[PDB]
Design a protein around this motif. Structure first.
Motif, short mmCIF file in Angstrom:
data_model
loop_
_atom_site.label_atom_id
_atom_site.label_comp_id
_atom_site.label_asym_id
_atom_site.label_seq_id
_atom_site.Cartn_x
_atom_site.Cartn_y
_atom_site.Cartn_z
N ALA A 1 -63.75 -10.88 48.26
CA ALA A 1 -62.73 -9.94 48.72
C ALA A 1 -62.70 -9.77 50.23
O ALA A 1 -63.67 -10.07 50.93
N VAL A 2 -61.56 -9.29 50.75
CA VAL A 2 -61.41 -9.07 52.18
C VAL A 2 -62.44 -8.05 52.66
O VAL A 2 -62.72 -7.04 52.00
N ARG B 1 -57.76 -18.52 52.85
CA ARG B 1 -57.59 -17.08 52.89
C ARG B 1 -58.27 -16.51 54.13
O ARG B 1 -59.35 -16.97 54.52
N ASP B 2 -57.64 -15.53 54.75
CA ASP B 2 -58.22 -14.87 55.91
C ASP B 2 -59.36 -13.96 55.46
O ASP B 2 -59.14 -13.08 54.62
N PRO B 3 -60.58 -14.15 55.97
CA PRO B 3 -61.69 -13.29 55.53
C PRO B 3 -61.51 -11.82 55.86
O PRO B 3 -61.97 -10.97 55.09
N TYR B 4 -60.84 -11.50 56.96
CA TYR B 4 -60.77 -10.13 57.45
C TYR B 4 -59.40 -9.49 57.28
O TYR B 4 -59.25 -8.30 57.56
N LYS B 5 -58.39 -10.24 56.83
CA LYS B 5 -57.05 -9.72 56.63
C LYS B 5 -56.47 -10.30 55.35
O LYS B 5 -56.85 -11.39 54.92
N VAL C 1 -56.19 5.64 37.50
CA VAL C 1 -56.39 7.06 37.73
C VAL C 1 -57.77 7.27 38.35
O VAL C 1 -58.77 6.81 37.80
N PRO D 1 -63.08 9.62 30.81
CA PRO D 1 -62.76 8.47 29.95
C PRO D 1 -61.75 7.52 30.57
O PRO D 1 -61.66 6.37 30.12
N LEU D 2 -60.98 7.96 31.57
CA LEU D 2 -59.96 7.12 32.18
C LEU D 2 -60.42 6.42 33.45
O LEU D 2 -59.82 5.41 33.83
N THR D 3 -61.47 6.91 34.10
CA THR D 3 -61.97 6.30 35.32
C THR D 3 -62.96 5.19 35.00
O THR D 3 -63.67 5.24 33.99
N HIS D 4 -62.99 4.18 35.86
CA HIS D 4 -63.88 3.04 35.69
C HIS D 4 -64.55 2.71 37.01
O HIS D 4 -64.03 3.01 38.08
N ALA E 1 -59.37 8.44 25.54
CA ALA E 1 -60.68 8.11 25.00
C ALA E 1 -60.87 6.59 24.99
O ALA E 1 -60.97 5.94 23.95
N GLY E 2 -60.90 6.05 26.21
CA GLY E 2 -60.73 4.64 26.49
C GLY E 2 -61.37 3.65 25.54
O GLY E 2 -62.59 3.62 25.36
#
Ligand SMILES: [Cl-]
Ligand SMILES: [Mg+2]
Ligand SMILES: [Mg+2]
Ligand SMILES: [Mg+2]
Ligand SMILES: [Mg+2]
Ligand SMILES: [Mg+2]
Ligand SMILES: [Mg+2]
Ligand SMILES: [Mg+2]
Ligand SMILES: [Mg+2]
Ligand SMILES: [Mg+2]
Ligand SMILES: [Mg+2]
Ligand SMILES: [Zn+2]
Ligand SMILES: [Zn+2]
Lengths: 77, 91, 244, 103, 95, 135, 41
Positions: G16-17, C63-67, F52, G2-5, F123-124
């Motif tokens: 992650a990138v 996997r590309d670290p930056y893209k 959301v 209640p919907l946001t996490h 009300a998750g």
RNA sequence: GCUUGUGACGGCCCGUGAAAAUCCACAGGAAGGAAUAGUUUUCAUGCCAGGUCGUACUGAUAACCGCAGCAGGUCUCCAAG
RNA sequence: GAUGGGGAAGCUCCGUUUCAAAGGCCUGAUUUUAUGCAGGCCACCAUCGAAAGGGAAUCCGGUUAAGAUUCCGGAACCUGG
């Protein structure tokens, strides 16, 4: 190039506002195990396709001709 | 019935190339054309593709190996050396 | 005389490498932040044959670290590597076959291959089938590592140079006799135009220094000094000794 | 015993110069040039052919409906059913295993 | 000796061989012990462990491949996983 | 040691709903005259709600929280049981063998299931159930 | 609410990138820019 | 049976036997959207246009090259009893 | 085989993505007018090279002193809009 088998659909094609010509062909052919009968083919010339309806009943064939719109140009044999 | 006494698979070469050279090719031809057990699925369905490539007919697994055998003697020693050295790094 | 055979090869007209069917240049990943600090995981997608190369090649996807995409690398496969295996490359990688580590992160006696001469040149040493490099010691001062090369020579390499744990796959290839001129023909058909070879003593004096004479013979010592010029270097160049 | 000829100017037997002998309503034998046969699309993982996908030349896929080119399932027309089954099971079990490693 | 204990349950107890039938037994709660070969794929092994967790079934890992596990159950074919329905005179469950 | 109960959450493995989470309503261990195999009647999610944020307006939040349910008879071999649970008493009476084999009754049950899922999502609670699986 | 996490991202090696950061220190400047800065040095 | 196409297989390699334009599908969910109303031109039918250059004939013991209407030379498809 | 660059008194030589500030289609913004102007996307970075490789789409019948899968009759198909 295309064959139709529903008579109700055939009448709708004859008044599709792009159909101007049609022809009727009579063929003298034999049935499965009996003497030769009369076969008629109704051909409707569309813009891109030719529609053919074949009915092997002479009695039912004559009624279809009388029901064709008068404005349609019909070619015989 | 038994068709050849000692030439075996090298009977396709007839009387050419010399007996000693034909004998050496015989040992390696049998190894490269044999079937081997798959260490992943347990079946005897591993045969060579190109030299050094060994693929199992089942389970679609390909393993890099020796030119004419799945595992060379040198490669087996390397595995033991790496395993012995790895055990002395973590513990 | 005329230009001899070994002089004509440098022009590179009909003596270039036949590279139509090559899978690509076999190199390690470019040395980046992930390699020099931690490790990155790749997966072996397929092991394939390479024309003109005895050893097989492995295609590993990272996997590309930056893209958000996938980067594919071409490695020289070691013995034991299989499709679907996870490959770990970096300074903090484990000591397992197929992993890529700096030379200073492994103990003495470790067997490695595709070793970098300098950190970042992506593999130069122990690339042919069945060859490997043995690490014989470390010098934490000046950050150097001493290794043994396949030819038997001893080399001092930087500890930041990378290498792949294991031995190059495909070993034992040269133990099988070619047994016919046809197999030699197909071998060099995928490499270059260097076969067959005509002996110099079978030529005329205009063609080769060994040519001519009412018998086939060299006529003078075949040991040629290092200081000779092009057109003279034919035979045994700067030979320290001869004979069996 | 009628003998035929090529209908193009290519006189060689190449892959793009294949012919088939047919009989016309005129009662004669005439060569008919045929196109190269299509290859079935293959799975993205195992490489086997995909069930329920039409076999056409690459350019002809633009002339057919979407029904001929897919299957009503996730990854339909790209991965086969068994490979999709493996992906779902692997994804679920690994994600569950990550939770137990966290705690 | 697992081989001797596993051999005894064949002659007296009720067992089940194969992956498909084992999952059915775990799903129905009829299983009491599952034995998995060493060379079983990890994904299949992970799924079997998850099933046994839901049904509270003890899991034993055989120290051998599918060739060796088939021999231990006295069969001439490879066996990947063995499900024990009920023991007879053997004490494999209490060991 | 039986876990396929009337509130168990599973993952569909085949049949146009593969990879979509589902909850078992009525199980049938000993098959039936039709479907002669172990099977369960399940209600699931076909279109998961979208994420959301706080920047979304009143109109956009309502649109993004819509859920499209489905009801299906599934073989046991095509389900992957999970360790999660979801109460079905609010809609267990509307889904049964009778509600199938009739186009009108299928839609009436689906809208009842839709209302139950929407209120559950608000009300998750059961956050794992309403999260789309990635594969 | 209640919907946001809250779903923090992991930006470690192999995770992650990486997000967009200021890379002005690493910009490959034109030739005329480099020569006038290195003339000062 | 002959010619040819094709399918599933098997043998062989220290030989494992092009590239690109181009077309499609999937993952993803940015946006656009219904109640007195809209989207689909990947369903059907209907409308318009499709430029430029080559195209005759020989293809050989007489139309090609060998000073020629030269027993030489010159790539290939179809193949009856 | 150009460009950027480096050689050569010079005719010119090397090199083909190279020590280069190397480029334009989805729109939003504007109803003073045509596109100035807001984000982002993408960095691949001339061109030439096959009438046997790759490749969107046509068939039958008839017609001339000499033309046709090109004309006539009938019946289709593709691409762009
Ligand atoms: Cl020479
Ligand atoms: Mg001579
Ligand atoms: Mg000389
Ligand atoms: Mg001399
Ligand atoms: Mg062509
Ligand atoms: Mg002509
Ligand atoms: Mg001439
Ligand atoms: Mg002349
Ligand atoms: Mg030039
Ligand atoms: Mg061109
Ligand atoms: Mg003519
Ligand atoms: Zn296998
Ligand atoms: Zn597949």
């Amino acid at each position: 190039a295309r064959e139709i088998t529903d008579i109700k659909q055939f009448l709708e094609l004859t008044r599709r506002a792009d159909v101007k010509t049609a022809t009727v062909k009579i063929n003298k052919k034999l049935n499965k195990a009996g003497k030769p009968f009369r076969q008629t083919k109704f051909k409707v010339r569309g813009s891109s396709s030719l529609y053919t309806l074949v009915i092997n009943d002479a009695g039912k064939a004559k009624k279809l001709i009388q029901s064709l719109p008068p404005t349609l140009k019909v070619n015989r044999l | 019935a038994k068709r050849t006494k000692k030439v075996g698979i090298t009977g396709k070469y007839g009387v050419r190339y010399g007996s000693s050279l034909r004998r050496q090719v015989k040992k390696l031809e049998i190894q490269q054309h044999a079937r081997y057990d798959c260490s992943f699925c347990g079946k005897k369905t591993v045969k060579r593709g190109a030299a050094g490539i060994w693929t199992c007919s089942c389970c679609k697994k390909t393993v890099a190996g020796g030119a004419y055998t799945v595992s060379t003697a040198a490669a087996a020693t390397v595995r033991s050396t790496i395993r012995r050295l790895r055990e002395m790094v973590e513990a | 005389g005329r230009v001899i055979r070994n002089q004509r090869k440098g022009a590179g007209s009909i003596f270039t490498s036949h590279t139509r069917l090559r899978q690509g240049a076999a190199k390690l990943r470019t040395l980046d932040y992930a390699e020099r600090h931690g490790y990155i995981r790749g997966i072996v997608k397929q092991i394939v044959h390479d024309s003109g190369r005895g050893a097989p090649l492995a295609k590993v996807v990272f996997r590309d670290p930056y893209k958000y995409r996938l980067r594919e690398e071409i490695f020289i496969a070691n013995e034991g590597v299989h499709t679907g295996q996870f490959i770990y490359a970096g300074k903090k990688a484990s000591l397992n076959v197929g992993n890529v580590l700096p030379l200073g992160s492994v103990p003495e006696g470790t067997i490695v291959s595709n070793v970098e001469e300098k950190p970042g040149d992506r593999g130069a040493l122990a690339r042919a089938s069945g060859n490997y490099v043995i690490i014989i010691g470390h010098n934490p001062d000046e950050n150097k590592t001493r290794v043994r090369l396949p030819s038997g020579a001893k080399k001092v390499i930087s500890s930041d140079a990378r290498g792949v744990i294991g031995v190059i796959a495909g070993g034992g290839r040269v133990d099988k006799p070619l047994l016919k001129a046809g197999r030699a023909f197909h071998k060099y058909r995928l490499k270059r135009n260097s076969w067959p070879k005509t002996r110099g003593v079978a030529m005329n004096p205009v063609d080769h220094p060994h040519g001519g004479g009412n018998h086939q013979h060299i006529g003078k010592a075949s040991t040629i000094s290092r200081g000779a010029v092009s057109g003279q270097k034919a035979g045994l160049i700067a030979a320290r000794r001869t004979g069996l | 015993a009628q003998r035929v000829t090529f209908r193009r100017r290519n006189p060689y037997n190449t892959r793009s110069n294949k012919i088939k002998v047919v009989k016309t309503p005129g009662g004669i034998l005439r060569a008919q040039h045929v196109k190269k046969l299509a290859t079935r699309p293959k799975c993205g993982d195992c490489g086997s052919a995909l069930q329920g996908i039409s076999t056409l030349r690459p350019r002809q896929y633009a002339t057919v409906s979407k029904t001929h080119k897919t299957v009503s399932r996730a990854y339909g027309g790209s991965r086969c059913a068994n490979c999709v089954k493996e992906r779902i099971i692997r994804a679920f079990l690994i994600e569950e295993q990550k939770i137990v490693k966290k705690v | 000796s697992i081989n001797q204990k596993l051999a005894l349950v064949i002659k007296s107890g009720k067992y089940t061989l194969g992956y498909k039938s084992t999952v059915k037994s775990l799903r129905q709660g009829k299983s009491k012990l599952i034995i998995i070969a060493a060379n079983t794929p990890v994904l299949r092994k992970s799924e079997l462990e998850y099933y046994a967790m839901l049904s509270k079934t003890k899991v034993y890992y055989f120290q051998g491949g599918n060739n060796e596990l088939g021999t231990a159950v006295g069969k001439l074919f490879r066996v990947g996983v063995v499900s024990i329905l009920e023991a007879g005179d053997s004490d494999i469950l209490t060991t | 040691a039986k876990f396929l109960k009337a509130g168990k959450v599973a993952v569909v493995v085949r049949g146009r709903y593969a990879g979509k989470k589902v909850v078992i309503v009525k199980p049938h261990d000993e098959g039936s005259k039709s479907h002669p195999f172990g099977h369960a009647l399940v209600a699931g999610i076909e279109r998961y709600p979208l994420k959301v944020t706080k920047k979304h307006g009143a109109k956009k939040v309502a649109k993004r929280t819509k859920i499209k349910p489905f009801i299906k008879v599934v073989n046991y071999n095509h389900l992957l049981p999970t360790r999660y649970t979801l109460d079905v008493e609010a809609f267990k009476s509307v889904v049964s063998t009778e509600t199938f084999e009739q186009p009108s009754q299928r839609e009436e049950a689906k809208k009842v299931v839709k209302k139950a899922f929407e209120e559950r999502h608000q009300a998750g609670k059961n956050q794992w159930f309403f999260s789309k699986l990635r594969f | 609410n209640p919907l946001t996490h809250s779903t923090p991202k992991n930006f470690g090696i192999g995770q992650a990138v990486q997000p967009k950061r200021n890379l002005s220190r690493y910009v490959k400047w034109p030739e005329y820019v480099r020569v006038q800065r290195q003339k000062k040095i």
